[PDB]
Amino acid sequence: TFISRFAPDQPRKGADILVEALERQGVETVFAYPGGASMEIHQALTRSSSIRNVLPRHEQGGVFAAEGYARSSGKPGICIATSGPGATNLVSGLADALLDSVPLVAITGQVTRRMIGTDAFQETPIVEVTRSITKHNYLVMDVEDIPRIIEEAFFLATSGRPGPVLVDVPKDIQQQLAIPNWEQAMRLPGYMSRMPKPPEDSHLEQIVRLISESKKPVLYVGGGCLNSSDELGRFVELTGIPVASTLMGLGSYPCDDELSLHMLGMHGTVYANYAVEHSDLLLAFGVRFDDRVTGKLEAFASRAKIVHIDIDSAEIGKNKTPHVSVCGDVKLALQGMNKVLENRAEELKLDFGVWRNELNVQKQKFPLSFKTFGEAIPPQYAIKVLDELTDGKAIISTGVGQHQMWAAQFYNYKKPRQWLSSGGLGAMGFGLPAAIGASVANPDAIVVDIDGDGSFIMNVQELATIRVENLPVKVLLLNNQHLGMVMQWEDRFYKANRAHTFLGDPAQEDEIFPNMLLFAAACGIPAARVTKKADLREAIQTMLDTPGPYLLDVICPHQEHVLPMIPSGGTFNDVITEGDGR
Amino acid sequence: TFISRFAPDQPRKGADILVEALERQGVETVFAYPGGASMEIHQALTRSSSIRNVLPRHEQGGVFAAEGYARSSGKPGICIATSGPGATNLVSGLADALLDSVPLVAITGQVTRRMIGTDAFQETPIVEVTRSITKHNYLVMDVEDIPRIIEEAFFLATSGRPGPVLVDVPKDIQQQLAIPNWEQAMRLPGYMSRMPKPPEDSHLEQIVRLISESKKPVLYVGGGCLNSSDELGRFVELTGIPVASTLMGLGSYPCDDELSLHMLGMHGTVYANYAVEHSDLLLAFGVRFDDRVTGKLEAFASRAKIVHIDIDSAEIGKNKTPHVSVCGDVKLALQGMNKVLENRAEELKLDFGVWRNELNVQKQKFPLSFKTFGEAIPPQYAIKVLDELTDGKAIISTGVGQHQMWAAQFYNYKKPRQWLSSGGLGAMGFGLPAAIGASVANPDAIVVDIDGDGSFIMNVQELATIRVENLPVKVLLLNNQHLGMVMQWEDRFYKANRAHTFLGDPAQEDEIFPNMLLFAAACGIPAARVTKKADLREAIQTMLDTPGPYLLDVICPHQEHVLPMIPSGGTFNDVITEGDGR
Ligand SMILES: Cc1cc2nc3c(=O)[nH]c(=O)nc-3n(C[C@H](O)[C@H](O)[C@H](O)COP(=O)(O)OP(=O)(O)OC[C@H]3O[C@@H](n4cnc5c(N)ncnc54)[C@H](O)[C@@H]3O)c2cc1C
Ligand SMILES: Cc1cc2nc3c(=O)[nH]c(=O)nc-3n(C[C@H](O)[C@H](O)[C@H](O)COP(=O)(O)OP(=O)(O)OC[C@H]3O[C@@H](n4cnc5c(N)ncnc54)[C@H](O)[C@@H]3O)c2cc1C
Ligand SMILES: CCOC(=O)c1ccccc1S(=O)(=O)NC(=O)Nc1nc(Cl)cc(OC)n1
Ligand SMILES: CCOC(=O)c1ccccc1S(=O)(=O)NC(=O)Nc1nc(Cl)cc(OC)n1
Ligand SMILES: C/C(NCc1cnc(C)nc1N)=C(/S)CCOP(=O)([O-])OP(=O)([O-])O
Ligand SMILES: C/C(NCc1cnc(C)nc1N)=C(/S)CCOP(=O)([O-])OP(=O)([O-])O
């Protein structure tokens, strides 16, 4: 039973209705940056005792923080911005949350209704702008629609395939007094009828049937399984099928397990891509068959019966035509198949040890390899040390680039929602604010931002947010003085011709630039730089043991390449297993 | 006669056609940030000897730099970004350039044509997103359309009412070889027929007629006069009409002149708003009648014959219905009226000294006033010192907030395109990157960023750009530890209830946070902080005399308010002339 701060017959500002609507949704944390068109909302936020605001230094940092809050908890992330430039600064985050299916609710202020369309001060048609990069958006035209729209927004952002929902609120609606009707019925008749049903036993038994008939089965696990950790693990015990995970599904099945094929795809392991290439049954659970994973669609699992389970009917058969499909919650589908596999255990006699050995041979012959050059710190080894000293229990957020892939390869995530990384959009500057949101969602957790010197500096202003909010955010900065991922493609396909990929100072060419330690110093964050590989273990240990925020500038040779690499649009026979920029 | 780097019969990559298309447009500087979908363009940029790339650290910094390049030169600014997150990071700049009518050409990379619509890697419908916040945009579907689209883009961005034009280029189009046809005809038949004609002598003589019949004429000069500096000055000699300028038109008529009413509007001087309130002839040249200037439209120039000259027919009569209108270039309209006023000089006998004295009385009774508290540095006085030591010849870019208004009030700009500030959108984080673009456009000029501690930190990452590019950018940081403009509205209309407007550290409440000097130190920029008013003159002099970049942290008491202030939607009789937050 909810307790309001106002009488049931007492009129209150629309902004106070908006905030209370968040309270009834269980919202404890918001990332709001104030502005002229949203001052009423910020005033109403101070009157709330249950909602905490984490003030960022940039609205892109605010929405990225809401993402980290969401990806690392399963809750929806809530960011609030003002009209005009405040709203447009959320755009990268909205498109990011859409492509990665992150539950997110963005509230933007707006000019008064009579000023809309008149090119008013700090006015942009944010609804018209964001319609193609959100799951849905609203323009509140009456104060009485606030309780219904906010309920629909949270329902749409979290149910089905999650995504971002933007709610544009004009200033006059925030000031207008009203008595909210919390018993309103949502106007989502078509969307709720389109919601998938629990999976039938008919479809589930045909899948278990195909599992017994198969001799080379591979699990293709993606971001749709982040809530099916236990159900997937139980499913693997009953089948023994190896698990190949995507960049988004990392942690769903423990990466340190003997049945784990780790990540597959363009920068996936050689054995994971081998398993899918030579499989006869591909169990695609919670994936969307991205070109980063498949490459050439005709050659991806070219001799496999493809079972695809997805809660979005639009994804089933979009890129890869499956044999058997199940449109519904993969969590329920695993529960139904676990009871079938458990009762009919002795009837099926499932044993794929021959197929597993065929893959375990590939593990030994083509594992994840990195080269150590003298005393220079290899970034892969730096991440592996972070895995050890944290026991694989840390929440890892990353930027985008070489360091993002190495954080995916050389860290063994044991649970889902430990791995926070922009996959679909691939937005740099994501790691640091996402670490902020993850730490507020998980205060007693180890949050480490494995960032790159290009990505880190983009939203470096959020270091101020980390200190002011006193968040124990660790920044493992893998500094290579380059836009490494773009530099790697320059070495491979453009004869190492540098096209504006060096981030340092050409005058002082051998000096590390900028001095990221002084960025942390400016915001009162203790920092340190480690260059020699011997000091690396003690440096990372100091970062973890030192309470509060900490930045560790880990210098790395820039000639490193992410391996292995399947070129874009290529097949498994085009995999690059060796080579760098030397 | 243009000289190509390729034979007229030699095939070349579409990216090389794109870059050469820029060369034929006279483009010398671009602000490009590389990414996977635009690597071909960046490779083609290195082959160009005439086009320089200024690599920012954030694409929002890139587009804002293109704005400063444009507003401070009259040329179009050119920014280039990759697909997905690179493109979405341009959004705030595009909407900014649209509302302020800044000539700007944005080029975004895109996934290959066959991948569009498939939710591909780093794909966003940037054309669908930006259609409502650009003058026009394109999606290049064939390599042969590049020479025509780039020509149309620059023509649309610069002709008529300027604005931003985005050109989305897929990756396969950049790689495809072709022989460009530079003699292509632009497909803009309706837009060119809609282009305004030179003004008729019929309309111009009726204006001069109304000038002689008027006894209280006021000039309402805005951003449309930035290229009519001489024509407007000559027009004032022949009429003697006082000049009230907008936030965008600052510098069109010298602010230090005896006929200058300085800025009018919400935060405009008392005498400028008085002149418009009690005028009988309002010569609105190059304005759009913003609510920041008019407030309540019915009371704005309620007893004045309104002559409106604008190159956009959509603006004539949108908010304020005029008596006489001229749809065309105000530069030509002034030339035509100057010949009429010069020949018929003795016939007209123009003398408004009675009206000028009525205003000069208001200048003495209600001037721009600031209060000095002990030794605390008043920001107004700090800007006035910058005016002295630079002789009013510096290029000033600002953020958005209290410091933006004080930079508009207490600096006497002598020429147009010295004042670079986000007016319509009002985007924070604009000053520092715009200063970058202005310095590259005007290397031998004094470029000073009068930024606020909130705005400055948003795009603080561009300090690295300033050092790497060795730009003599001065940063006059007016640090008040608050979001001052939002704080001012809290004091006036919300009983000084702080709603997330303090930017410092609440733990160390009296410590200046963050330490902006260390931000400059991180990027190898010499910096200094001045707190006592006595040291202010020497500190600013050191900033100017020290070659290269320099950051000056000017600490100011946060209780200052921007005065005078006409509340939003109010009239002249509601002007607030005194008060602060103490
Ligand atoms: C530089 C870079 C390199 C990359 N290279 C790789 C790579 O090598 N390998 C790789 O895997 N990724 C890579 N990516 C990321 C890639 O772009 C995609 O993010 C990823 O390939 C696709 O993730 P996904 O298949 O799990 O689908 P997601 O984006 O995670 O979407 C989840 C899917 O499952 C469905 N779903 C969601 N919830 C449920 C539910 N409860 N029940 C049932 N279904 C549900 C959804 O409808 C959706 O289709 C890279 C990214 C970057 C930036
Ligand atoms: C915090 C804040 C406070 C502000 N308060 C004020 C204030 O007090 N006073 C103020 O003035 N502004 C203020 N503004 C800015 C305000 O929002 C607008 O930018 C400004 O009021 C309008 O500028 P403008 O009238 O010159 O039109 P512009 O935006 O500069 O547009 C130029 C107009 O002239 C036309 N035009 C362009 N070129 C030509 C040409 N060659 N020939 C003929 N016509 C042409 C265009 O069609 C257009 O209509 C403030 C901004 C902020 C961020
Ligand atoms: C930025 C807010 O925009 C608006 O809401 C707005 C826009 C156009 C006309 C009237 C209003 S209003 O009268 O409904 N409200 C304001 O104008 N608020 C406002 N807040 C701040 Cl902090 C500053 C400002 O102008 C400088 N104006
Ligand atoms: C980010 C570029 O996006 C694309 O162009 C793209 C998208 C989807 C499918 C194929 C391509 S592609 O084969 O036409 N080109 C690439 O995929 N380029 C690319 N560049 C970098 Cl530097 C990295 C990368 O994947 C990590 N991919
Ligand atoms: C520029 C770019 N990609 C294009 C790009 C541009 N801008 C954004 C916001 N996102 C992306 N993905 C990359 S992956 C460079 C990464 O550089 P980094 O942050 O220092 O990481 P690393 O050097 O390990 O590759
Ligand atoms: C938050 C805000 N306005 C809302 C806002 C939010 N975000 C952006 C990008 N732009 C704007 N205009 C202002 S004007 C605060 C200005 O703070 P400042 O940069 O330190 O300048 P000052 O303190 O002098 O007002």
Ligand SMILES: [Mg+2]
């Ligand atoms: Mg289908």
Ligand SMILES: [Mg+2]
């Ligand atoms: Mg790097």
Ligand SMILES: [Mg+2]
């Ligand atoms: Mg009209």
Ligand SMILES: [Mg+2]
């Ligand atoms: Mg930034």
Ligand SMILES: [Mg+2]
């Ligand atoms: Mg400030």
